[PDB]
């Protein structure tokens, strides 16, 4: 451990072992100085043009954190093609972490001449929060991941958190967390940092699509032995009376047959079309949205429960706020055009789940009599019933991996609505910060705190290794499957590759459910 | 504690003179929508058939119906089928032909009369109890739970 | 009692990388037509951000 | 009875994600007269039925 | 006996694949009369290697 | 055809590169990749010994 | 070393912490450029200083366009050893059998 | 392995051993920075005065 000797290597490799796969990825980072080393109250109120639905209260800290909670940090696009073609599922088991080659630099600005020189004595402060005593920011799909392409250099985000509020004011039950109250390890150049984490048990991910549906689980050749009500009014003519008639279900009346299972839950949303001439001519993005009400606020049900996107031959329809939407390379932040975003599709789960843009079913409404016509009622929102089945939302190449289950008394089927894995004890947050170095103090005493600092920033590498567990394919199916493939004809540039200017780019969101399985 | 879940169906009578005079077997049925199809919710969730002293009422597609010996396949008469009865579970489960409860609808004030709202379909709430549907001498035994990511109370 | 809410679990300083539908009708005037527009969630549009 | 099974559809047409299973691809035991066949299965745990 | 793949190539490969859109009958499968049929001759050289 | 020796497994290629060092990054966040670098170059010796 | 250019004053100063990345490709997973008689050898006279060439490779084409069977190789996907000043690098190779050269 | 200590020698010599000969050669190299650390597509077409 000296100045003139490096303290690491470059490990970026993926190995396959039958039922395991170990992926390692290495990047290079740089950390600036946040808030000029100060804690700051930040808030938003109901004054101005703002509404009550968008207010907050919180604090902002000089610490920066690491986010690798997204699948493209670990999987090269060939390895994503090896994964989804040959397996019925996967879950992770354990991971590791390693920071090394810390360099700390200082900058000086004198009359346009900006000089950068080494600093060999300054430190950085890194610690992990294992016992979960902080707010958990990860798993909320923010920016700042490791880059998809290994030759790129990225910038570390900033750590800030929210508390309770009443408008732009706090309450008595609010909290303030000072991040210099936790034990941390200080590293000069020539040091390093590492730890090792172990996942708990979790269900496998369902990386398959059923080849069969709930309404078609019967034998097409044998009648049933169990009747139903088939006729109430006679058919002799116009002199009809009331009667009772019964029949057996068979091959020609397969909608009337008795069934054992129910489709999944429904929470209906509004339908919009990709052809702009077929929609209503008003701004209905928020007024017609699907919302859930929570303490005088209307939060957007995004992306809602796991429901199918569109039925057969209707690829142009999609729910307004019920799917994941991914932006292309160099898309605008506000008011991006339709040709600049990528819409995903969850048509694989229509074998069990209802379509998000249609109702669940039809129930009875009153008590029919001799002088009373019977009435029906359309169910738009249905909770759980005994005997339902459903499928969770699919995972993607650039979607998130995990999410922390909130510590409450009760929860029901704790899978994340953005897809991925549900964990009670997630991977811990890692917080990094430059230790301050003062400027020249006065010669006489002063009890004020020092506010004149030397401007610094740091850099180095990072290494993440995650081991996955697999489940192999074991089907007896005769005809060929469906595989993810490339395009055969020529193009201007190769997909999943660099530009002629050096810009990496992803053409399309890749799903996971391509193989088949019977119900 | 709370009663079990509800998913309401239409009521029909075994006295043919007491029903409505139209063909309402499919148009007034209880359905669930799945990818541009309307499948019949048969026999729905586990709910009771009829309340006290109302043995002549039954849900239109919510019970198991068994055919007698030498019953016809299509258009069997009422005297040729056998209707079952799940009146045992009315101690906890709601009746299939009636609503679940009544909830509030607005914010009453000095110049505003309060309003109510009838709940016909209720999902799970914290603290419910219910009973599964009974088994019979000529009914089935098992069923394979489908291999998905999530399911809730996997009883057939 | 939790010190934080479900609608406020995000980072207040970093934009997202995942779009949403932000505009259907043009704003050039009273001669408006139908269109499609997309935007990123950020610190000022925290009600529109994608949630888990 | 006879064994037949269903797959996905779009009307009277299949899709790309459909499946075809050939039943002579599995190992099977051939019996002349004078042979026999048997196996033994074990159920997993399950709640009691509420017969009350 | 086999020989496994050991390349360092970055962008995605070319794979043999099926067709995604619907059809009148599934390829490499039987007719409605019971006649097996092969649609096309399949090659072998789809992966890559440097010289 | 240019003369010499024919080998199935030739001597392996050796690849060398300078690892990049960034310039000063901004104080606010930006999800673009960094494109401002410090200009560097390296030098040294090499030794090849072949037995015939 | 690192260089700085301010108004015609080109200054060269040491850098003691920066690294270089060296690796060998034993399992022949890359294109093979050597043996095609390019420039950039070691010099014939030992007292000379030379300059290292640049690595580029070719694939299939149809005119100025690629095809589906083309390849892209990213060279930061292979394991490599990083050297600061004060390190070193070495390996050892063994030729297979080959006929003698006919020097007669 | 430090800053103030060299890590090699100069070996440039040829020895003869009856039926072997071992040759050693040493040079001194320098490596610049190529393409400003970027991968670049390069190509040539049939347009202009070029041929196929």
From TrEMBL, chain A:
Residues 1-491 form the Coat protein VP1/VP2 Parvovirus domain. GO terms for molecular function: nucleotide binding; structural molecule activity. It is found in: Virion. It comes from the Viruses. Coiled coil: none annotated. Its main location: virion. Keywords: Capsid protein, Nucleotide-binding, T=1 icosahedral capsid protein, Virion. GO terms for cellular component: T=1 icosahedral viral capsid. AMP binds at residues 415, 422. Belongs to the parvoviridae capsid protein family. This is Capsid protein. It comes from Adeno-associated virus 8. The lineage of its organism: Viruses, Monodnaviria, Shotokuvirae, Cossaviricota, Quintoviricetes. The chain holds residues 220 to 738 of 738 of the full protein.
TrEMBL record, chain E:
It is found in: Virion. It comes from the Viruses. Signal peptide: none annotated. Belongs to the parvoviridae capsid protein family. This is Capsid protein. The lineage of its organism: Viruses, Monodnaviria, Shotokuvirae, Cossaviricota, Quintoviricetes.
TrEMBL record, chain F:
AMP binds at residue 6. It is found in: Virion. Belongs to the parvoviridae capsid protein family. This is Capsid protein. It comes from Adeno-associated virus 8. The chain holds residues 636 to 687 of 738 of the full protein.
